[PDB]
Amino acid sequence: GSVAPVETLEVEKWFFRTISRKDAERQLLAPMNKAGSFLIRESESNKGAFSLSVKDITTQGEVVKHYKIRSLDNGGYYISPRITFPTLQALVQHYSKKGDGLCQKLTLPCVNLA
């Protein structure tokens, strides 16, 4: 195209592997990040399911979030049954414009160096 196609593996602080629960949470809960940085970790039990942590900001201290991602044979991923996606990038992208499903939309993934 134009100085780009040359080993461009995507590994941003959004599409993570099956990090531990508290781990993904430890990262989001970092004071560098806030509501919007996410972790879509894979459920290391199911051959196709995932999970997603987001920082939640409440008066009862700063926490994370937990949204269950399913994998449909003809619907990619879905968290709210009123809205399905083909991959998590298109899921996260859609949620990157508003807070349709999540109460706090996506801003910026987590910072490097946990």
PDB file of C-alpha atoms in Angstrom:
ATOM      1  CA  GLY A   1       0.000   0.000   0.000  1.00  0.00           C
ATOM      2  CA  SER A   2       2.262   2.691   1.381  1.00  0.00           C
ATOM      3  CA  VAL A   3       5.024   1.752   3.887  1.00  0.00           C
ATOM      4  CA  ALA A   4       2.973  -0.555   6.103  1.00  0.00           C
ATOM      5  CA  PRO A   5       2.742  -4.232   4.931  1.00  0.00           C
ATOM      6  CA  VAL A   6       5.825  -5.619   6.677  1.00  0.00           C
ATOM      7  CA  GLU A   7       5.198  -7.708   9.797  1.00  0.00           C
ATOM      8  CA  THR A   8       2.415  -5.762  11.508  1.00  0.00           C
ATOM      9  CA  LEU A   9       1.273  -8.117  14.259  1.00  0.00           C
ATOM     10  CA  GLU A  10      -1.481  -6.490  16.312  1.00  0.00           C
ATOM     11  CA  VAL A  11      -0.873  -6.833  20.069  1.00  0.00           C
ATOM     12  CA  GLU A  12      -2.403  -3.765  21.706  1.00  0.00           C
ATOM     13  CA  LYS A  13      -3.531  -3.547  25.285  1.00  0.00           C
ATOM     14  CA  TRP A  14      -7.063  -4.518  24.302  1.00  0.00           C
ATOM     15  CA  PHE A  15      -6.752  -7.944  22.539  1.00  0.00           C
ATOM     16  CA  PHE A  16      -4.913  -9.864  25.275  1.00  0.00           C
ATOM     17  CA  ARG A  17      -4.528 -13.638  25.769  1.00  0.00           C
ATOM     18  CA  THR A  18      -5.887 -15.598  28.740  1.00  0.00           C
ATOM     19  CA  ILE A  19      -4.267 -13.515  31.373  1.00  0.00           C
ATOM     20  CA  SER A  20      -5.354 -14.219  34.874  1.00  0.00           C
ATOM     21  CA  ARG A  21      -8.512 -12.532  36.114  1.00  0.00           C
ATOM     22  CA  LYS A  22      -6.815 -10.439  38.737  1.00  0.00           C
ATOM     23  CA  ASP A  23      -4.048  -9.783  36.242  1.00  0.00           C
ATOM     24  CA  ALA A  24      -6.035  -8.043  33.559  1.00  0.00           C
ATOM     25  CA  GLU A  25      -7.673  -6.229  36.457  1.00  0.00           C
ATOM     26  CA  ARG A  26      -4.247  -5.265  37.963  1.00  0.00           C
ATOM     27  CA  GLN A  27      -3.372  -3.624  34.674  1.00  0.00           C
ATOM     28  CA  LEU A  28      -6.608  -1.714  34.127  1.00  0.00           C
ATOM     29  CA  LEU A  29      -6.693  -0.686  37.810  1.00  0.00           C
ATOM     30  CA  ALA A  30      -3.252   0.878  37.219  1.00  0.00           C
ATOM     31  CA  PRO A  31      -3.256   4.643  37.923  1.00  0.00           C
ATOM     32  CA  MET A  32      -1.965   5.225  34.425  1.00  0.00           C
ATOM     33  CA  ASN A  33      -5.253   3.932  32.932  1.00  0.00           C
ATOM     34  CA  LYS A  34      -8.945   4.546  33.587  1.00  0.00           C
ATOM     35  CA  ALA A  35     -12.477   3.793  32.281  1.00  0.00           C
ATOM     36  CA  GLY A  36     -11.933   2.676  28.695  1.00  0.00           C
ATOM     37  CA  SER A  37      -8.712   0.704  28.810  1.00  0.00           C
ATOM     38  CA  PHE A  38      -9.810  -2.938  28.393  1.00  0.00           C
ATOM     39  CA  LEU A  39      -8.603  -6.557  28.390  1.00  0.00           C
ATOM     40  CA  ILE A  40     -10.439  -9.108  26.357  1.00  0.00           C
ATOM     41  CA  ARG A  41      -8.911 -12.208  27.888  1.00  0.00           C
ATOM     42  CA  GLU A  42      -9.739 -15.657  26.587  1.00  0.00           C
ATOM     43  CA  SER A  43     -11.617 -18.059  28.774  1.00  0.00           C
ATOM     44  CA  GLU A  44      -8.947 -20.820  29.164  1.00  0.00           C
ATOM     45  CA  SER A  45     -11.706 -23.430  29.389  1.00  0.00           C
ATOM     46  CA  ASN A  46     -13.724 -22.934  26.208  1.00  0.00           C
ATOM     47  CA  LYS A  47     -12.478 -23.461  22.660  1.00  0.00           C
ATOM     48  CA  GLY A  48     -13.813 -20.106  21.449  1.00  0.00           C
ATOM     49  CA  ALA A  49     -15.164 -17.994  24.334  1.00  0.00           C
ATOM     50  CA  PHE A  50     -13.598 -14.843  25.850  1.00  0.00           C
ATOM     51  CA  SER A  51     -14.148 -12.277  28.665  1.00  0.00           C
ATOM     52  CA  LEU A  52     -13.639  -8.477  28.911  1.00  0.00           C
ATOM     53  CA  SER A  53     -12.435  -6.232  31.791  1.00  0.00           C
ATOM     54  CA  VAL A  54     -12.870  -2.407  31.755  1.00  0.00           C
ATOM     55  CA  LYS A  55     -12.103   0.011  34.492  1.00  0.00           C
ATOM     56  CA  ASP A  56     -15.240   1.010  36.370  1.00  0.00           C
ATOM     57  CA  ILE A  57     -15.338   4.242  38.221  1.00  0.00           C
ATOM     58  CA  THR A  58     -17.679   4.229  41.190  1.00  0.00           C
ATOM     59  CA  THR A  59     -18.006   6.037  44.496  1.00  0.00           C
ATOM     60  CA  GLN A  60     -17.186   2.640  46.126  1.00  0.00           C
ATOM     61  CA  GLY A  61     -13.577   2.761  44.941  1.00  0.00           C
ATOM     62  CA  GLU A  62     -12.092   2.168  41.504  1.00  0.00           C
ATOM     63  CA  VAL A  63     -12.758  -1.293  40.100  1.00  0.00           C
ATOM     64  CA  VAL A  64     -12.880  -3.200  36.794  1.00  0.00           C
ATOM     65  CA  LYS A  65     -15.790  -4.759  34.827  1.00  0.00           C
ATOM     66  CA  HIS A  66     -16.680  -8.245  33.590  1.00  0.00           C
ATOM     67  CA  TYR A  67     -18.609  -8.742  30.268  1.00  0.00           C
ATOM     68  CA  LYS A  68     -19.147 -12.335  28.973  1.00  0.00           C
ATOM     69  CA  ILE A  69     -18.293 -12.818  25.233  1.00  0.00           C
ATOM     70  CA  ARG A  70     -19.844 -15.826  23.467  1.00  0.00           C
ATOM     71  CA  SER A  71     -18.860 -17.293  20.110  1.00  0.00           C
ATOM     72  CA  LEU A  72     -21.599 -17.930  17.611  1.00  0.00           C
ATOM     73  CA  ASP A  73     -21.264 -20.166  14.615  1.00  0.00           C
ATOM     74  CA  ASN A  74     -22.956 -17.454  12.571  1.00  0.00           C
ATOM     75  CA  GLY A  75     -22.552 -14.395  14.725  1.00  0.00           C
ATOM     76  CA  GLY A  76     -18.892 -14.087  15.800  1.00  0.00           C
ATOM     77  CA  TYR A  77     -19.139 -12.543  19.261  1.00  0.00           C
ATOM     78  CA  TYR A  78     -21.997 -11.166  21.304  1.00  0.00           C
ATOM     79  CA  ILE A  79     -22.280  -9.682  24.799  1.00  0.00           C
ATOM     80  CA  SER A  80     -25.715  -8.098  24.596  1.00  0.00           C
ATOM     81  CA  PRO A  81     -28.100 -10.144  22.443  1.00  0.00           C
ATOM     82  CA  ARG A  82     -29.424  -6.962  20.838  1.00  0.00           C
ATOM     83  CA  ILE A  83     -25.926  -6.594  19.218  1.00  0.00           C
ATOM     84  CA  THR A  84     -23.635  -9.196  17.662  1.00  0.00           C
ATOM     85  CA  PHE A  85     -20.256  -8.724  15.826  1.00  0.00           C
ATOM     86  CA  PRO A  86     -17.984 -10.828  13.546  1.00  0.00           C
ATOM     87  CA  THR A  87     -14.772 -10.384  15.564  1.00  0.00           C
ATOM     88  CA  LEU A  88     -13.893  -8.639  18.708  1.00  0.00           C
ATOM     89  CA  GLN A  89     -12.263  -5.810  16.743  1.00  0.00           C
ATOM     90  CA  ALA A  90     -15.627  -4.887  15.225  1.00  0.00           C
ATOM     91  CA  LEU A  91     -17.183  -5.380  18.641  1.00  0.00           C
ATOM     92  CA  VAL A  92     -14.725  -3.137  20.389  1.00  0.00           C
ATOM     93  CA  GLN A  93     -14.847  -0.597  17.478  1.00  0.00           C
ATOM     94  CA  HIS A  94     -18.614  -0.294  17.751  1.00  0.00           C
ATOM     95  CA  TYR A  95     -18.288   0.166  21.492  1.00  0.00           C
ATOM     96  CA  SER A  96     -15.474   2.620  20.649  1.00  0.00           C
ATOM     97  CA  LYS A  97     -18.115   5.165  19.481  1.00  0.00           C
ATOM     98  CA  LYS A  98     -20.664   5.104  22.257  1.00  0.00           C
ATOM     99  CA  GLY A  99     -21.804   3.219  25.321  1.00  0.00           C
ATOM    100  CA  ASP A 100     -24.501   1.190  23.729  1.00  0.00           C
ATOM    101  CA  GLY A 101     -23.877  -1.931  25.683  1.00  0.00           C
ATOM    102  CA  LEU A 102     -21.218  -0.828  28.130  1.00  0.00           C
ATOM    103  CA  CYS A 103     -21.934   1.991  30.525  1.00  0.00           C
ATOM    104  CA  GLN A 104     -18.547   3.464  29.663  1.00  0.00           C
ATOM    105  CA  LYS A 105     -17.392   3.388  26.163  1.00  0.00           C
ATOM    106  CA  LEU A 106     -13.852   2.744  24.964  1.00  0.00           C
ATOM    107  CA  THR A 107     -11.245   5.435  24.965  1.00  0.00           C
ATOM    108  CA  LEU A 108      -7.653   4.131  25.156  1.00  0.00           C
ATOM    109  CA  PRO A 109      -6.369   0.557  25.778  1.00  0.00           C
ATOM    110  CA  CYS A 110      -4.031  -0.185  28.727  1.00  0.00           C
ATOM    111  CA  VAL A 111      -0.527   1.263  28.964  1.00  0.00           C
ATOM    112  CA  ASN A 112       2.409  -0.980  28.190  1.00  0.00           C
ATOM    113  CA  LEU A 113       4.553  -2.343  31.030  1.00  0.00           C
ATOM    114  CA  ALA A 114       2.237  -3.907  33.609  1.00  0.00           C
TER     115      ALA A 114
END
